[PDB]
Structure 1
């Protein structure tokens, strides 16, 4: 009798210990595009040293040209318009802004902000419905009120920033639609493997997509959650490609490396260690799911399959 199965470790954490306390600045808006911007059409670059990978290995690019996905960090409204314009040059299909952020976020006077709590876990434990309700309520409450917006600096605490009286409030959905993109929200908790609910919702969405749909995934930094869903998409759409190639190529186009590697964090970040290990095992488990259920058209969803085929540490 296990309390939390692998893939659900974050459920053991106490939400009350990571409550939001400040409007974090999501992007300073100085660059034309969000950070870590990349597409499946991009050329593969040398792997990052920290993953101790084979720099000589050349992964197959089979299916990358038809993949039609991209990823990035959070963005200002102008930056998102730039992304959309760039993605429109690559396709005539619907372009989706796939928001993977569980944390409450939006735009105050056009400034991309998020309600930040320790570890960015201000909405930990909330259902997607409660997180989005908190988001709507917090954004609305900011209108015509004085707010402190700051970037995090030394030790993930506010540093400098600015104070203003908000005259306009927008949700990311509004910002996406103003950029001509369709919007899809998946409330994934920062730093950890996406929940079975997060993944079931994604696979359900994925099967409704027209052939030429282009998915632009993003989280806060554009690394952890963004690459997890990019990899999942790659595996679903190109089930013939080996796990190694999927992981290598999503990393080499600019994303995270979701395969095994020597995990090393700063003392102050030791809490991330088991979550990285968990991600590695779940990635392999998701690959198994795709391989075992593609043939029948996914009659059984990921959550159900995972419960009868639990992952092991």
Structure 2
């Protein structure tokens, strides 16, 4: 019968072989001291971005913020992560986690953070976390003592310039995190789309294990879409008394994405993104509902089970 694919799971209808990886893309040139979009739940709010059409004078409740203990950023060189860790240490005496949100195969070649890139950044689309992590290990390791082309992308998201090098060292994301004094947790979530129910179940089960003074540093590709998603989830889960509006505004105003509805004006070039943007907005609301309606336990029912019997609507 139906649905073939429910709201929250639109990406399952896309075809993986149409998006296979073809180049090692540079994640950061390492010039700056910190990764891009670095931000912390202890930071002061800034004015919202114009594109979102929000009242710059609305001040969301800061209730829960000082105890939230989360941060986000884009990808980083190992030195940049050490800089991150030193900054987070000033704010907490607890275990600091790098929470790595990327489904794609990624790591470090001669210390250079790289990702195996396919169109739309969907090189591991459809792979289980097991399958995605296996590809990663095989592919990083195959690079050692071999010549690779690593480049940034430019016009039409194709390789432009870059360098070619014969790799003398390979490191995993866990290795780079460990070296900076951070614990590591991986969630293999596809870039650009709402995380699968399994992605979220896995985060929730991990969240439940954490010591209360754990600090979560989320990172993804550009440290905007996916990082804000999980920051928002953590914020709601840990602070269920604050309104949906206040969570969305405050997470946006410390420098993340705004996950509420806004005048979405994409190009014809990125017309494919429109339904995924709209899916994310609906699902953020659904997860708010999950938090609100399952707060009476316990959270006896996991997200994926609750969601299956409480579908969001288009």
CA–CA distance in 1 between the matches of 2:251 and 2:220? 16
RMSD in angstroms over aligned alpha carbons?
A: 0.5
Q: Deviations over 1:138-187 (max 9, x none)?
A: 00000000000000111111110000000000100000001000000000
* Gap regions ≥5 residues in structure 1: none
The TM-score, its normalising length taken from structure 1, stands at 0.99
> How much has 1:53 moved relative to structure 2?
1.1
Q: Deviations over 1:58-96 (max 9, x none)?
A: 100001001000000000000000000110111010000
CA–CA distance in 1 between the matches of 2:60 and 2:255? 14
> How much has 1:267 moved relative to structure 2?
1.3
Partner residue, 1:109: 110
Q: What secondary structure does 2:165 align onto?
A: strand
Greater shift in the superposed pair: 105-114 or 289-298:
289-298
Greater shift in the superposed pair: 247-256 or 259-268:
259-268
CA–CA distance in 2 between the matches of 1:207 and 1:223? 24
* Gap regions ≥5 residues in structure 2: none
Q: What secondary structure does 2:269 align onto?
A: helix
> How much has 1:125 moved relative to structure 2?
0.3
> How much has 1:266 moved relative to structure 2?
1.5
Partner residue, 1:128: 129
Q: What secondary structure does 1:241 align onto?
A: coil
Instruction: Show structure 1 runs of 4+ deviating over 4 A.
Output: none
> How much has 1:42 moved relative to structure 2?
0.5
CA–CA distance in 2 between the matches of 1:229 and 1:66? 16
CA–CA distance in 2 between the matches of 1:59 and 1:81? 32
Q: What secondary structure does 1:100 align onto?
A: strand
CA–CA distance in 1 between the matches of 2:45 and 2:5? 38
CA–CA distance in 2 between the matches of 1:272 and 1:50? 16
Partner residue, 1:154: 155
Q: Deviations over 1:96-152 (max 9, x none)?
A: 000000000000000000000000000000000000000000000000000000001
Give yes or no for the alignment of 1:192 onto 2:156: no
CA–CA distance in 1 between the matches of 2:296 and 2:70? 23
Q: What secondary structure does 1:164 align onto?
A: strand
> How much has 1:269 moved relative to structure 2?
0.6
> How much has 1:16 moved relative to structure 2?
0.2
> How much has 1:221 moved relative to structure 2?
0.2
In the alignment of these two chains, the number of paired residues is 313
Q: Deviations over 1:236-285 (max 9, x none)?
A: 00000000000000000000000111111111011000000000000000
Q: What secondary structure does 2:272 align onto?
A: helix
> How much has 1:54 moved relative to structure 2?
1.4
Q: What secondary structure does 2:208 align onto?
A: helix
> How much has 1:2 moved relative to structure 2?
1.4
Q: Deviations over 1:173-202 (max 9, x none)?
A: 000001000000000000000000000000
CA–CA distance in 2 between the matches of 1:79 and 1:266? 33
